[PDB]
């Protein structure tokens, strides 16, 4: 009544890159 | 006469970190 | 006789926010 079970599927695609970071603080003095 | 379906694939790899932020403004002149 | 292949795996997650930008240049000369 039966035959061989099918193979496992492939690994998924790489995720997208993250967003740019925020601006840095005003420079030192005194 | 056919066999059963095969199993799902594994998750994709993470995305890369975002770019560094913009430089801060100068300290007060002296 | 072969059963069908399994489905692809899902996408990877988005990458993290990039680092804060560098401090500004000094107010003092140097």
Q: What DSSP letter does each residue of chain A carry, written as one string?
A: ---PPPPPPPPPPPPPPPPPPPPPPPPP--
* Contact: C27, B27; criterion CB under 8 Å: yes
C8 chain-A contacts, CB cut-off 8 A: 9-12
User: Looking at chain A, how many residues does it have?
Assistant: 30
From CA A3, how far away is CA B17, in angstroms rounded?
Answer: 47
Contact B9 A16 (CB under 8 A): no
Question: Cβ(C21)–Cβ(B19) under 8 Å?
Answer: no
Most distant CA pair in chain B, distance: 88
Q: From the CA of B1, how many Å to the nearest CA of chain C?
A: 6
Least CA distance to C7: which residue of chain A? Answer: A9
């Amino acid at each position: 009544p039966k035959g061989p079970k099918g193979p496992k599927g492939p690994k998924g695609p790489k995720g997208p890159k993250g967003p740019k970071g925020p601006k840095g603080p005003k420079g030192p003095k005194g | 006469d056919p066999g059963d379906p095969g199993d799902p694939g594994d998750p994709g790899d993470p995305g890369d970190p975002g770019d560094p932020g913009d430089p801060g403004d100068p300290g007060d002149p002296g | 006789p072969p059963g069908p292949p399994g489905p692809p795996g899902p996408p990877g997650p988005p990458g993290p926010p990039g680092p804060p930008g560098p401090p500004g240049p000094p107010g003092p000369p140097g």
